């Protein structure tokens, strides 16, 4: 079971890795504490498959608070994915960065947040605004130090009207808090 799943995850077969990820998700969705296998899944994180990346990000988000110490091995992967040409991958990475409730994790993501603040994609802009709002909610002092208020204010005066609305909602939430 657990040993077989770990052996499958430690294999070089993409189909086997996908099957193991699906089994872990089903166990996690069924009510199985799969947080102990988070370090094993850490190595099998940098994958070209988009579906596997989403499942890995979901597991890390659900296993981030449980194992904050073991979450230190995902900063490099997040940094690498922050420059992904695919807008969907960038949006997923931005969403995962803000969803990780790690005090020391958001500190290293400040540079990717600054890089993605000027994302040309309206979906990318909305994801960057959401990540900035999440960082401000987690760390208001960190958000103030990063100086995202100036970028957020100018976001409403840009195109991508849905992205403008997302930035406006984020700014209102920051001011509301």
């Amino acid at each position: 079971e657990i040993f077989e799943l770990k052996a499958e995850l430690n294999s070089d077969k993409k189909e086997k890795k996908k099957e193991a990820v699906k089994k872990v998700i089903a166990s996690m969705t069924v009510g199985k504490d799969v947080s102990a296998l988070f370090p094993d899944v850490v190595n099998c994180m940098q994958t070209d498959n988009l579906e596997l990346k989403k499942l890995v990000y979901l597991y890390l988000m659900n296993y981030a608070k449980s194992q904050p110490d073991m979450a230190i091995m995902a900063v490099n992967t997040f940094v690498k994915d922050c420059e992904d040409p695919n807008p969907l991958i960038r949006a997923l990475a931005v969403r995962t960065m803000g969803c990780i409730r790690v005090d020391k994790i958001t500190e290293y993501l400040c540079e990717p947040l600054r890089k993605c603040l000027k994302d040309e994609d309206p979906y990318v802009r909305k994801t960057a605004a959401v990540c900035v709002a999440k960082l401000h909610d987690i760390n208001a002092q960190l958000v103030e130090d990063q100086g995202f208020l100036d970028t957020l204010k100018d976001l409403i005066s840009d195109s991508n009207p849905m992205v403008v609305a997302n930035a406006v909602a984020a700014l209102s939430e920051i001011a509301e808090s």
């Binding site: 940098q46 091995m73 995902a74 490099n76 690498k80 290293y108």
Partner: peptide
Amino acid sequence: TIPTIGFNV
């Protein structure tokens, strides 16, 4: 490359 915070595969 920046500092190797994580790992490169």
